[PDB]
Structure 1
Amino acid sequence: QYRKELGAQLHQLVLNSAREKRDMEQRHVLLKQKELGGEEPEPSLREGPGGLVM
């Protein structure tokens, strides 16, 4: 009884995960193709606690 109760929760969790990670895959192949930058990281100048943070 514990075994079928758990298993049936388990099937939904790994189906949920298969959908979840396949969407991540659809965004990553999309990032790589369209938004993948070649330049170095760039610091960001802003206002902050007792003057500007960078």
Structure 2
Amino acid sequence: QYRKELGAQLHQLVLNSAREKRDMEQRHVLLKQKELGGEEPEPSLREGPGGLVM
């Protein structure tokens, strides 16, 4: 029973990972295509001016 229930789950996991990584390769592709940007990224302030975390 555990050998089967671990096994049925591992074959759904692999098909799920295949799909998740397909989905991740295509989105990986997309960023490099047209929207990656060349300008420096911006430091993000938080916790208002009296914590002012940056």
Output the CA distance in 2 between the equivalents of 1:47 and 1:3. Answer: 51
% identical aligned pairs: 100
RMSD, aligned α-carbons = 2.3
Structure 1: gaps of 5 or more residues: none
State how many pairs are aligned. Answer: 54
Structure 2: gaps of 5 or more residues: none
Relative to the length of structure 1, the TM-score reads 0.73
Larger proportion of helix: 2
Relative to the length of structure 2, the TM-score reads 0.73
Task: Please give the per-residue CA displacement for 1:1-43, whole angstroms capped at 9, x wherever unaligned.
Answer: 3212210111001111110111011111001111111112223
Report runs of 4+ in structure 1 exceeding 6 Å deviation.
none
